[PDB]
Design a protein around this ligand. Structure first.
Ligand code: HEM
Ligand SMILES: *[C@@H]1O[C@H](CO)[C@@H](O[C@@H]2O[C@H](CO)[C@@H](O)[C@H](O)[C@H]2NC(C)=O)[C@H](O)[C@H]1NC(C)=O
Ligand SMILES: *[C@@H]1O[C@H](CO)[C@@H](O)[C@H](O)[C@H]1NC(C)=O
Ligand SMILES: *[C@@H]1O[C@H](CO)[C@@H](O)[C@H](O)[C@H]1NC(C)=O
Ligand SMILES: *[C@@H]1O[C@H](CO)[C@@H](O)[C@H](O)[C@H]1NC(C)=O
Ligand SMILES: [Ca+2]
Length: 595
């Protein structure tokens, strides 16, 4: 008797099962469970939820109440003692470009979004959470430990609001609290197109017969498109420079302006759409706008899928790739394609790959102008640096020629994120993404590190000597034991990222298992996977497989010098060629004659 049937929320489907196009919502993908993988549904649970009261309260909520016999250490204290570091010298990944970091964020944003409880608006008790550091309801503040330098400048806590959850807005109660995924679980470019029909419509240029996405009307990048601004206020990008007064961008995903490189990437994807559509009109003057919109959408979705599985995943999972993701054997509708709640924390390995600076580069890949190199913290929610300071090309060059940060057991997350994160609402480049992640694991009722090792068939250390061996690191194991007292309590974000990386990859065994399993399911449980015969033709697939990130850049920027292997580290000029040496997407196979 599955207590399945909470809650009402989103209108529960309307299918043309036989349409060759995805819905915007993800409904109608699976024929027998038509809501599977759709936006605005509960994140999947691969293990039962672990909550202080067994139902919804996070571990850490009640001071005297222990997890497995021990107090859960403060998320900020773990961030300060384990995750932090001062010295930015020597931290970079010698064989991953900064595009490696950024593509990972793009992928994450296509697959998952668990937004915060919205209640705080129309009310100040929300502003009171921050003002007075008071725990209650969806207020779950991150308290500072003693000796925290932020006590001298910033008060006693960093406010934190709990993630939204299904049966959604009333607090309690029935089965364990299940957080929501607000985007489609399929790898479908929902971050470009939107996951809800409201937004999908707004993003489109409905005035045009070419099936284009709306572009900025106030500014251009040497005649190429920007994303449109959001006309609603206060978007925080206005607040960060009140002289420039440049709003955030409007995109398929509301996080698109969070940081400037993400917005950059969003912009290349939007241009590519409009490129594809125009090109498809030239080839098929008889197609209407809807047809044009949908066919371009379908190709861009293929693009995202192909780059991710062919170029990105093999260099994340390295030698574990083949073990969790065998060669594709066709669509299987018995597979659950939903993103799991645990994945939303496993994929935050990306946070350990973000460097402390971003560069703008000129055409000789030299520092562009006197302010060429910028600290990452000044870029959160920053659109003015694109629109008033050179467009996206100098930033895209930096993506190609600069490097991702390497995850290092002694230098985990840069201070730009760990001390200077900007959150839109109460004035300050002062939050801690690591602390947030840890607190969020607890918020989400995450099982601990040993439960996940068990799930993956991996050994479960119970002692310091055991942990030293799994981590291959004596100091890091001792520091974790001092805070957590048992490896059973280590929060999954920090335990999975603490493990030494597998050969040719950039995550450890535990993460390789959790990431690999999720990506297999999203390929296998998707009716519209690009390789599923009949979604495209053989000739279309032959053409799609010539696509690369280098070509995306060549086609939609004024950059002409590019590497062949965009994700590896590439030193200019030796690893660079010009755009005339890089294969093009041959659109001939989409010429249709309706004679
Ligand atoms: C995965 C992933 C998440 C969780 C997505 C989900 O909601 O299910 C994620 C989250 C965040 C958040 C929200 C934090 C919280 O309230 O719990 C912020 C503010 C943030 C900021 C930035 N991140 Fe991130 N992040 C995920 C994945 C990745 C990856 C993966 C490869 C990278 C890289 C990345 C980078 C950044 C980033 C860079 C400048 C900022 C800022 N994130 N993330
Ligand atoms: C806020 O944004 C403005 C607008 O871009 C920045 O000023 C520009 O930068 C340089 C020199 O300051 C010039 O090339 C532009 O013409 C400037 N415009 C104006 C109006 O000054 C300004 O630097 C930004 N300030 C901060 C603190 O972010
Ligand atoms: C960089 O990584 C790729 C895998 O992407 C590998 O094939 C290549 O040999 C690596 N380069 C070096 C110098 O190790
Ligand atoms: C929509 O396309 C039309 C015709 O191609 C163009 O004139 C207009 O600027 C576009 N509008 C938006 C908002 O992008
Ligand atoms: C489809 O997946 C389910 C669950 O993983 C499995 O029982 C079934 O054997 C799979 N089908 C094929 C052809 O592998
Ligand atoms: Ca999606």
């Amino acid at each position: 008797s599955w207590e399945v049937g909470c809650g009402a929320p989103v209108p529960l489907v309307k299918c043309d099962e036989n349409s060759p196009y995805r819905t915007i919502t993800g409904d109608c993908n699976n024929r027998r469970s038509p809501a599977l993988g759709a936006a605005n549904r509960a994140l999947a649970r691969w293990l039962p939820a672990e909550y202080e009261d067994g139902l919804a309260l996070p571990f850490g909520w009640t001071q005297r109440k222990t997890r497995n016999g021990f107090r859960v250490p403060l998320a900020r204290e773990v961030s300060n003692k384990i995750v932090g570091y001062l010295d930015e010298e020597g931290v970079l990944d010698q064989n991953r470009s900064l595009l490696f970091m950024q593509w990972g964020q793009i992928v994450d944003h296509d697959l998952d979004f668990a937004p915060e409880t919205e209640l705080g608006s129309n009310e100040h008790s929300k502003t009171q959470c921050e003002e007075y550091c008071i725990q209650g309801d969806n207020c779950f503040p991150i308290m500072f430990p003693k000796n925290d330098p932020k006590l001298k400048t910033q008060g006693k806590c960093m406010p934190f609001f709990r993630a939204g959850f299904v049966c959604p807005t009333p607090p309690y109660q029935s089965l364990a609290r299940e957080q929501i995924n607000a985007v489609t679980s399929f790898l479908d470019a929902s971050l470009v197109y939107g996951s809800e029909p409201s937004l999908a419509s707004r993003l489109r240029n409905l005035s045009s017969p070419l099936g284009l996405m709306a572009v900025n009307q106030e500014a251009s990048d040497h005649g190429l498109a920007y994303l449109p601004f959001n006309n609603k206020k206060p978007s925080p990008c206005e607040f960060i420079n009140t002289t420039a007064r440049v709003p955030c961008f409007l995109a398929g995903d509301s996080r698109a302006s969070e940081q400037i490189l993400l917005a950059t990437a969003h912009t290349l994807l939007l241009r590519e759409h409009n490129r594809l559509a125009r090109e498809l009109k030239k080839l098929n003057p008889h197609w209407n706008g809807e047809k044009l919109y949908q066919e371009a959408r379908k190709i861009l979705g293929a693009f995202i899928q192909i780059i991710t599985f062919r170029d990105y995943l093999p260099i994340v999972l390295g030698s574990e790739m083949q073990k969790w993701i065998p060669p594709y054997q066709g669509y299987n509708n018995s597979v659950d394609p939903r993103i799991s709640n645990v994945f939303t924390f496993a994929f935050r390995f990306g946070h350990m790959e973000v460097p402390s600076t971003v560069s703008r580069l000129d055409e000789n890949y030299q520092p562009w102008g006197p302010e060429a190199e910028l600290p990452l913290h000044t870029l959160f929610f920053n659109t003015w640096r694109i629109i008033k300071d050179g467009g996206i090309d100098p930033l895209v060059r930096g993506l190609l020629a600069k490097k991702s940060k390497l995850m290092n057991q002694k230098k985990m997350v840069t201070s730009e994120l760990r001390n200077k994160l900007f959150q839109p609402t109460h004035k300050i480049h002062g939050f801690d993404l690591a602390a947030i992640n840890l607190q969020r694991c607890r918020d989400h009722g995450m099982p601990g590190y040993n439960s996940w090792r068990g799930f993956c068939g991996l050994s479960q250390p119970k002692t310091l000597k055991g942990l030293q061996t799994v981590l291959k690191n004596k100091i890091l194991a001792k520091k974790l034991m001092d805070l957590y007292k048992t490896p059973d309590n280590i929060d999954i974000w920090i335990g999975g990222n603490a493990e030494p990386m597998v050969e040719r990859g950039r995550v450890g065994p535990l993460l390789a298992c959790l990431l690999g399993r999720q990506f297999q399911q999203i390929r296998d449980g998707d009716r519209f996977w690009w390789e599923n015969p009949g979604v495209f033709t053989e000739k279309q697939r032959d053409s799609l497989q010539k696509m690369s990130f280098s070509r995306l850049i060549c086609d939609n920027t004024h950059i002409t010098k590019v590497p062949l292997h965009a994700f590896q580290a590439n030193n200019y000029p030796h690893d660079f060629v010009d755009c005339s040496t890089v294969d093009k997407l041959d659109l001939s196979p989409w010429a249709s004659r309706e004679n």
